[PDB]
Structures are given as structure tokens and as C-alpha cells.
Design a protein around this nucleic acid. Sequence first.
RNA 1: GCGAUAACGAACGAGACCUUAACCUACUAAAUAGUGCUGCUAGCAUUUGCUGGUAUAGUCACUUCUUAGAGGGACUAUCGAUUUCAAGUCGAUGGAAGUUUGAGGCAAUAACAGGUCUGUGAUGCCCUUAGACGUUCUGGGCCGCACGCGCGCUACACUGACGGAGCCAGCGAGUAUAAGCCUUGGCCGAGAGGUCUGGGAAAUCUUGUGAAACUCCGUCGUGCUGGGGAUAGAGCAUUGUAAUUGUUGCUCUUCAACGAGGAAUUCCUAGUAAGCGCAAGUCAUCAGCUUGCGUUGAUUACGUCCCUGCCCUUUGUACACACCG
Lengths: 206, 100, 72, 140, 8, 141, 68, 84, 142, 48, 62
Amino acid sequence: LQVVELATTIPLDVQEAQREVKLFNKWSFEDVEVKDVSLVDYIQIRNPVFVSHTAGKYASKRFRKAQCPIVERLTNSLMMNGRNNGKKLKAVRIVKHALEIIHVLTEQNPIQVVVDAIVNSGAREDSTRIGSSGTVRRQAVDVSPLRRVNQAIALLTIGAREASFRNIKTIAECLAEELINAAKGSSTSYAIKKKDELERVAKSNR
Amino acid sequence: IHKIRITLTSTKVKQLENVSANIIRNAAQYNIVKKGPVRMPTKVLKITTRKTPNGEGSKTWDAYEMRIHKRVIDLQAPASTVKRITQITIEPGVDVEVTI
Amino acid sequence: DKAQHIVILDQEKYDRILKDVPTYKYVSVSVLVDRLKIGGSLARVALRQLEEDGIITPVLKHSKQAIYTRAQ
Amino acid sequence: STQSVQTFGKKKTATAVAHVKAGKGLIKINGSPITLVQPEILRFKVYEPLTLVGLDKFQGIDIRVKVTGGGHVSQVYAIRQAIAKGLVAYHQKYVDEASKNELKKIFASYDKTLLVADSRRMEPKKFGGRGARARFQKSY
Amino acid sequence: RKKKVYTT
Amino acid sequence: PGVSVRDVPAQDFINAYAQFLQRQGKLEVPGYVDIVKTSAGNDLPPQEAETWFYKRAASIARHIYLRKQVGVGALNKLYGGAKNRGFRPHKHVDASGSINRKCVQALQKIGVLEISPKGGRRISENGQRDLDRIAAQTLEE
Amino acid sequence: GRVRTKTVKRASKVLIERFYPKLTLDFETNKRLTSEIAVIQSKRLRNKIAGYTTHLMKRIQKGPVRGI
Amino acid sequence: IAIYAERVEERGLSAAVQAEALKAKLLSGLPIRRAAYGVLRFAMGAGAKGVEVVISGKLRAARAKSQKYADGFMIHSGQPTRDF
Amino acid sequence: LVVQEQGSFQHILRLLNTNIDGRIKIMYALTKIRGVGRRYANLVCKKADVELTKRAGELTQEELERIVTIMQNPTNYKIPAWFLNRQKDQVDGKDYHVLANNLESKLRDDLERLKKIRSHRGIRHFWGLKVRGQHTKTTSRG
Amino acid sequence: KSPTGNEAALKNKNFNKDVAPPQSTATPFDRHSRTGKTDSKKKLQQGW
Amino acid sequence: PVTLAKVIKVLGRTGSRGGVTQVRVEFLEDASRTIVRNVKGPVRENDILCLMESEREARRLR
RNA sequence: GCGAUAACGAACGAGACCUUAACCUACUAAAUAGUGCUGCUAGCAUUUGCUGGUAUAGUCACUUCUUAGAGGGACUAUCGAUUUCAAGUCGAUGGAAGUUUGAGGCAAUAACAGGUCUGUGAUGCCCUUAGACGUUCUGGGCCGCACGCGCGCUACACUGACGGAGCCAGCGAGUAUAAGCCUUGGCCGAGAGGUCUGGGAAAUCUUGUGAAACUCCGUCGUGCUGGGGAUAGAGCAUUGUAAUUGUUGCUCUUCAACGAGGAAUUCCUAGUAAGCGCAAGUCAUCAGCUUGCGUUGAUUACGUCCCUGCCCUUUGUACACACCG
């Protein structure tokens, strides 16, 4: 708690990071828990990070993606549609602003809302196709926890992307509305219509 | 006394390093202070042509190379001593230029 | 071509802004445009003054994004 | 002279050479304080080697790094590696090795790239395409 | 491929 | 402690030196500042017509402070950007020479610069004195 | 995959049939030993041969191996 | 400039000498089989590890053909082809 | 800061026989007048002491007449010759800047002046083809 | 209209009134020799 | 009424394109009633993947 | 490769190999690389400090970064699972590196009516050979425009446009009495560009190639709008003997379709794809092209034979010029 005097002065807020590592020095991982037993091992929130930008090697082995921080997996999916590939700093800026908007709204922990939106967005049964060389055939199969998690991130960012297209509303606050709505399970949000529509068709194939 | 620079250039390093070491050797038993050899950054002369003399087939390219290795040696000796060192270490591949 | 957002501030909208913006959980450039029907440029100048008048607390400052909240 | 250790950190092409001397808590980037390293959003990447161990470790040492090459992001990762490696290298030489093994534990337990340079380099381009693996679009 | 015919 | 130019953020130091350099008023502003484009790659003149020349001179002074005998051709490269060639790909094009050359000439007779040996323009004996002063009066607030 | 070839599999088992008493279960010792027993043209092949000889030695200590 | 002429020590080991010698035989009308085997056996007699002669073209036929006349051991891929 | 006004805003302006939307910013509202681009409109507003932070309808008549005066007489207000639309005119050799209705008239007069002498460029204008040497084999499909 | 320059300004481009052809592709036993001069076994026997 | 079933054995890749996997699941509660089921995403052992309906076995996919 | 085995033991190809990238505070040195000290010197606080400049004589020190030669290092190393307990595979730990460590170069036995005689003073034959199908000079064409198609570049916007400010690479190339190379610095010019000197035959100078995306602060405010920049007019320069059918560059003006694209179809598994620029080649001039290089940097498998091609085995054959039979 003591303030440490250096020759190069260090700001007060960053010296507070010595006590705890927090996302953007604002959000704590301590009070965050996954409200689903089946996705605990594939939503990685145990290792805190300061900024959702680690430049790690998560594409080498098969399940290394489960070790990437969940916010970094979310900011990775934002930079899509060609003109945004490789623009991670822009993606981190969007996530950083989105969390603040998620904080002033509903007052919850922003990264808790992120975790809630991910457990509620992954379809639990998807109808794979079993077409015999061209003919249309569908069979209902279960969805693995890893694909369940990473389809939630794919659907959450796709919905936020399309809501901000040709709209005065900015992407950071389109993502905040998309994440908040999916966290509370509202069917108004995209990626909850899709999740319901996936599990609805799967019910008509088993 | 004379500050004298010897520049060594060649395409192949085996003869270049022999001449380089041989000059350093003669500058050791002769109590001549020396600076070097200095391994200059090697130059990769690259030429990329098309394999086909005509223009038919898959677009395949050759990539020829010609590495040039350069060593400079600084000597503090009279001009008669340094020049005769060059004739001691004459090699067909390596060319020698002596500059004061 | 349906937007037709107001860019000139009359008197009816001015006091409506100071009576309605305080009763907002979260205000921004788009929130002002979306619900007050004013233009984006008029929204940006409204936010920079409403903060100076104390009605609005700046949660976060950025050129591309302005996150503001009520000061009450 | 005095207690001085000199190290370096690397990313893709960026290389940051850190000089760690005995002194006060002076931490400079190309002669400029670290509190204003750009880009701002990645400023905590270089704060990680500081706040992980506690700024008290830097009372007796001053650090001046010179980072050249690479890019904007690649230079930030080079700096944070040079600081973390510089602090460890100073402890190994002028402090007991028990603390150096202590410092190396927190750094490694948080991020491997703090001490170990990432070995990834750009794949060479091959003819027949605009990239390393990418090929010109084929038509029938 | 052509037969050169003169005019002058 | 001794505040220097390197101890203050660049973006808000230039905003402070531009304000001081304009209010001081001794910098001579050429008559075409309301007409010209900064670079041939630009498509519009600066939006801050009254103050853009002062801020650019402040940027030039600070940029020269941190280096040694930078010329005016290098300044064209520094402030140049990507040109908006219509259908052809983008390209780097240098900024206008006169604007940079006028700035360094204006700064050289106000006392901040001088002709350096072996080319370029060094910062003056007084150039360090008044920039380091502005740096101190920049970060106390 | 990491399937060793025949030029390394048969050359390594010739070492065991010829220098078993001098061999050991340590790759580092085997690597130095095979540099004085065989004339290997390249260092990479030397490490591959010594690395498979160690594996065979480690397997002989667990029971009899077929073909050696 | 000074030019010296030196005899090649091992004529069987020089492909240039063997190709020029073979050409001087083919232009004399000797049959290809008798000519090709004259260098195949000459190369091996000199101690070559291997030798291969390929003659391609047209010979008394409108259609062209190629015939390879190998001998001994030959390596094909990798660096050693640049060495041996 | 936000300020209010009543009855002073003018929704539709009419300058040089062109209708100007009054809620557009002045620098870009004047670009509706043919012959006035963003670069030119940016300068006449600075020569007329009309600050660019005003919408088109915000301007008073006194400012509007001061702008149309400058656009029609650029050289008289220290506007450089090289900045003008029609410099070194064909007939009288003076520097001009043609505007809304004059532009298509003098654009036309250039076409017949090319066609009257039956130059190659004038001929291709008659045919409706590209005149600046562009290939028409595969892109002239409109 | 003897000179081509004078006539060009009087000839109209009547191109948008006629329709393009529906198809325009205008650019086969490679194995069977067409030389008509077969090679006898004696010629191959004498040569090779 | 969703039921959770830990996977205990990865049988093998099934389906026409190999995009679906046969797996051996074990229920979290009542550690019995072991069932063979098909899963779309990548699967390791010890995945707590939940089942919308339990009373159904699985066989090879066409 | 293990293994099964009328086969046993081998050769070519694969793999080994070679070049390149990643590690080395372990050797060898470096005024054409860098640093710390030291002279001399500047600014700010005065705490002795912090940023600089200078030093081919301070006739210092060193090799960490930089360069390159001699080596070392990885062989799936150790430990768990599975397996015929074999070849192997999957997990961890250590490690710079554990996908053949990453990428290429080379690359078998025969062969194709594959492509080139429009690269060759490489070639057989046929044609022409003085009013030439030889060679040269002048001008035009290869660009020509109702149309179908392919390789690409710009875009359809706010994850953006402008306007200022921040300000980071790597691969390379470079001349003389030429027929003119890379060209800084100063001075003019809105620009393009012009002019005067100097450096560099090169780790020395161009050049830290201060590249672009990128980041910050402002204007714009969902509008075919400040998105987009075709089409066209006028003018100013550059290269060249010569710019007209605009070589190219710059200024003003003109403000088109396009508001994310049908049936189909391409490339791709990690520093990869995708963006983003830069150099070299062609080159008097012209790069929306290739050959490379670096910046930012992901999503998703790590599986299968469902489509497609090829390979193998069995099988039928009246084919062997081999189904174009």
C-alpha cells in the first residue's frame, strides 16, 4: 500500500497495480465466475492480464486456444472483414471502451457480463449434415465445450459488427448492447436468435 | 611507420580466410601492430530469371547467387614490408589492394 | 434519406435537452442523436458544454468515443 | 566502475539494449521516461515487468534502454523483455542467486516472452503467389 | 504470308 | 530535477509551444498560409487556418531539438503521407518544401535554429533555453 | 512424423553388436562415443544415430530385443 | 598474359575430353553402340565410380529418339552431385 | 457552446441560380454551385471572412453578397492565378474562373472549337469515345 | 469527303443500335500422325 | 432439464467428412448410464458437455 | 518403418545433403558497427543530477547488442499414457528451438507428337535472296470498339473520411570525359520541379531509405455525404530527336457506377491468411506486373474420403498406334 518513490516518478494509479492485476487497470477477475459447469475449463479467466493483447502462440497445438484469455479471444474476433485484419490496437480500443459502457449500464462487472454472454450464446446441439453425396440430410449432434465457447465469440462479434454497419451508433457501444443483451438472455439480441434457431432445428432432427 | 590498409575480396571463404590468416601470421612474428581482419557484411548478388527459354509452362524461377566476402586489415609498417607480405600470400581466387 | 436530424438549436429543444439529458443512465454522441433527434455535430457541442455545466460526468475521454454519465 | 549489467530483448526485428547501473529509480526509453511510451493502450505491457515484482526492486538501479528496428508494437515487446531480463541479470551478478531465482519465477509464471525471446520470424515468399503460402488465383 | 505488289 | 523536452509528451508539448509561439508573435508567417496545402499528397488545406503554421513550426523546432542537423528535404519526407491516387495503389509522397523551408527560416531568425556545419540546421544556443523552458511550463498543471 | 530411416536404424544396431560394453543409457555420452567409433559425415546424422542407439540401449535393459 | 598448356592427367575422369573424343568418333560415322561403349568402358577403366552417356537426336528415321547407356553407380539428388 | 436563434435560419438558399441547402456547412454547401469545389470554396470563405463553423442558413445577406462577389472576381482578392479554373483563356488570354451557368457554356465552346478545326480530340468527342488515350477494348461497355 | 479528318466529324457512331453476336468463340487427333511417311523397321534397325 | 455428461473415451472420427466424433459419455450425477453420443466440435476426454436429451444412443453417421 | 513372410541381403528415388532463419554475455577480432568512460562543451533543476553535441588522436576500454568464421546446441531429450508393447502417436517438463525445428535448392526408372527453330554465329529441309521475306530511313500499328471471359487495383464507409500531431522496418542498387549512376545540403517554387556545391565505385554517402497501415487530438454525422474518384476542360513542368491517339508528374474545375454482389468458383493451418507499404527487374520516361523484403497480425481444423485428381490392389478386355483404341 505504501507509495514507492522512484527517480522516474510513477503515477499513483499504476502503483496500485502492484496489489492486483486488473484488465485495463480497472476490472478485476477475482469476482468473476462461469455460471456453467461445462465451459469452466474453456473460458480462461484464472490468469489476469492488464491489456487484452499478449501476442502468444495459441495456434501451435490443438487446445491451446482454451489457454488464451477470454477477452483476448473476444478482441481477436472483432478485427474481421478484410479492412480490419491485423488492426488489433483498434480492436483493443473497442473492447476497452465497450467494457466501460457495459459498466455504466447495469452496473455489473463488465467482464462478468462478457462471461455471461458467452455461456448463453453457444448452441448446445447443432444439426450436422449427413447428406449422401449431394442430397439434403441433417442429423442432430451435440456441441463440444470448445466449439460452444468459440461459436459464442464468433456470433457475438458478428452481431455487433452488423449492428454498427451504416449506423451512427459506434462499434464499441454496439458491442456493449450486444454483450449486455446476450448476458441476460434476451431474445432481442443477435446470437441469441441464432442460438435458439440452431437448437430449434436440432430439436426437429432427433 | 605507415598506417596501411589491406583490402581482401573473394567469392569463396576458404582461400580468403587462408590469405587473411597468413597475412595476420606474418604480422605477428614480425612485431607489427595490426587491426583486423574485419569481416565485412557479405554481399549476396542475386539474379532471378525465368527457367523457360520460351514462355510456356508453370511460372518457375531460378535464383542464382554470388556471395562476395570482404576483409580489411590495418597495418603499421613501412611500405616495403607490407607489399612483400602480399606476394607471400598470393592466391588466384583472392585479389589484394593496398592503400596507405 | 429519412434521418433529417436537427442541426440548428431552437429554444424548444434547448430546454428539452437540459430537462431530459440528466435523466439518462448513459449519454454519448449517438445516444443524443438517437433519442433527442439532434445531429451528430450538435451532439458533440452539447456534450462538451453539458460537462462544463456540471450535468454530465465524464466517465472516459476519447476522440472516437465519448462515454458520459449523469452527475446526480 | 560501478555495478553495471547490459542486456537486450528482441521481438520480430525490434531489439532493445538495456543498460542497468546502480543508482536511483531511473527508467528511460531512448532518453525519455517510460510513463509516456507510445502507443498509450500498450503502456501496461512495459508496466508488467515493474508492477509484477514491485517497484521497490528498482530503488538501487537505473535503467536506460535504446530500442531500434522492428515496428511500433514490436518495440514495446522488446522493451518489456529488456527490462525484465535486465533486472534479472543485475540480481544474478550483484545480489544473491536466491532472489534472482525468485524474480525469474514471477516473470515466467506470468508470461514466457518476458524472459524468452519469441522465435517466430517471417516466412520467406515463394514465387507463384503473393505470399509465403498464398498462391495466385487459379482459373479454369 | 503476303505477295508484295508494287505500284510505282 | 531538470525538465527537458524528452520528459514531456510530444502531443501536448507542441500544443503548448504553438500557443506560446503565436502569442509571442515574432515568428513571421508567410502570406500564403491561407491558400496552400501542406503536401502534394494532401487534398485539402489545414482546417486550423489561423494557427496551423505556428503549430507546424513548433513541431519542426521540437523535432530538430531531439536530433542533429536535420535538413529540409528530410522534413518533407517526415510530414509527407500516403497520396490518394485514384485507382492505383497508395504511395508515399513528400510534403511541400516551401512550408518547411519557410518554417526553419522563420525559426532561424527568431533565435531557435542556425545553419549547422556539414549541412542541416542545428538547434541554437538559445533554442535549448526556451524549449526546455516551455517544457517546464507545460507539465506543472 | 519422427520415423527414423534405415540408414540410421541399421547403423545404430551395428554399434550395439560391436560396442555394447562401451555404450550406455546416456545420450550425451553416446553422442561423444559414436564420434570416435564411426566416421559420420554430418553432425545431424551423428545425433540421429546416437539418439536411436540410446533408445535401443534403453530398450535392451527392459528385456531382450529382436534382431540385435 | 602468359598461357600454358597442361595435359589432363586422367582422360577417363574428364567428361569434357570424353565428350570431345566421342564427338570426334560420331562424326567419323562409327555406330552409336560401338561409340557409346568406347567411353563407358574407358571411364570404368580409369576408375570411375559410375558413368552415363545419353545420345539424343534423329538417326535414319523421321521420328527422333534418345538412348541412355549407363554403367556402374550414379547419384542423382542433393549436394553430392555438385561434388562427385 | 450551444446557442439558439429564431427566424434567422434560411432553409433554402439561392446563389448563382443554384439551390443551396441551408443546413449544410458553408464550405461544403457552396460546392453545390457548379465550378466551385471544396478547395475553391474553402478559400473564398476565408477571403470573405466567413468563419467555416457556420451552416449555410446561418449566413446573413451581407456575407452572401460578399462571397458571390469574390467567386466572380478571384484575382481582385489576392487569389493566385494558378488556383483558378480557366487560366490563359483561349480568346483573351486572361485568367478566369467559370461558374455555374458559364461553365457548361465555355466547356461547350471548347468542344466546337476542337470540332471546328476537326482535330482528333474533337472528332473523338463527337463519337462519344474516350479522348485521353484510354483503351476501349474491354472497359468501354457502358 | 476525300480527307479522313473531314469525314470523321460527319460519320455517326451507330453502335448501340445493333446487338452483339450471341456467341463469339472462334479461337483434333494429336496422337495420330498426319505426316503420312511411316517409318519402316529397317530404318530403325539401321539407325539405332 | 439439461443433463451433463463427462466424456470418458473418444471412440473415433465418424460422419461422412469426419466432422463429427463418436465419444463415450458418463453422467456427472448418477455415475452410470454410460452412453455413446456424437459431438461436432473438437473433444478431449473429461469434457462436461451437456445433453439436451439423454434417452438416445448414437451410431455411425452417413 | 514395425511387422507378416519363399525369400535373403542390397542400389536409385524419399531421407540424408546444401543454402537460409531462429539460440550462444562460450571463442576471434573490429575508426566502414555499437556502447561505456574520458577530454572539451552546451541547456534545465541547482544535489554531485538529467538530456544533448563534439573527439579518423582522448594515438581510451569493451564486444552485450552489429558484422562474419570456427564451433557448440536437438537426437523427439526426460517422464506419463496408449500400441502387436514394435514402429509410432498423444500429453506434459525442461528448452531458443519438440508441426520433417521454419523455408527453400537439388531431385529416380522410363516418357509426352506438351512449348519454344520469335534467345542463340543451335540446327536439317522447304521458301525467298536485288523492285529482297536481307539491312536501313520516314510515318502509322501492336492501344484500334456493338460484345463474352481471365489475372488484378480502387471502393461501396463512422472498426471510416479528411486536418494537424506522434513516428517505427527489412531485402537491395548506385558513376568518369561519361554520353552520364545514387544523390544529401543551401537557395527559389503552392506544387511538380529548377538551380549551386559536395559525398559515395560504397557496413563510410544517398540512408536511421524518419515507408504505409498504425496511435493521439479535432472537423464531419448516416446524406451517394466531407464515402468513391471514373469521365472531361483549362493551365504549369519533367523525359526524350520526337509526347498528337492526353508517357509521366503537379494545380484548379468536372463528381459517374458502386449503398457488400446470382448461379458458380479460388487461395489458405502460424508470424500463416489477410491487410500495409518498400527495394530490385524491366527502365531516357512510365508499375494497377512480377521477384523479394519487412510492419500490423487473426478466425477455424489439426480430421475424413462426402466431392475432385492422382496412386495402389482385384477384375474384364476382341486394345498394344494401347479408348483420340
